């Protein structure tokens, strides 16, 4: 059954978390892009972004020229999930 599955029970949350751990321990810029692509192919929700804090991590990864191009788009895809205000002075 999908519920109480004895195998492949890994929630998107759990997979993102374990990848984010590998992002902080960054072994290669080559592997960093592979990691980002995995965060992007999971159903990311605002709940995951909040618990993992992965938004902070990937926004920081934008500093690397090697993976910053994809990391930018990664934050851009996540910006669609979170609410966005347009408060300004006048």
Swiss-Prot record:
Localization, UniProt: Nucleus
Signal peptide segment: none
Domain TFIIS N-terminal: 10-85
UniProt function note: SIII, also known as elongin, is a general transcription elongation factor that increases the RNA polymerase II transcription elongation past template-encoded arresting sites. Subunit A is transcriptionally active and its transcription activity is strongly enhanced by binding to the dimeric complex of the SIII regulatory subunits B and C (elongin BC complex). As part of a multisubunit complex composed of elongin BC complex (ELOB and ELOC), elongin A/ELOA, RBX1 and CUL5; polyubiquitinates monoubiquitinated POLR2A.
Record text on subunit structure and interactions: Heterotrimer of an A (ELOA, ELOA2 or ELOA3P), ELOB and ELOC subunit. Part of a multisubunit ubiquitin ligase complex consisting of elongin BC complex (ELOB and ELOC), elongin A/ELOA, RBX1 and CUL5. Interacts with ERCC6; the interaction is induced by DNA damaging agents or inhibitors of RNA polymerase II elongation. Interacts (via BC-box) with CUL5.
Domain notes: The BC-box, which mediates binding to the elongin BC complex, has the consensus sequence [APST]-L-x(3)-C-x(3)-[AILV].
Official protein name in the record: Elongin-A
Annotated source species: Homo sapiens
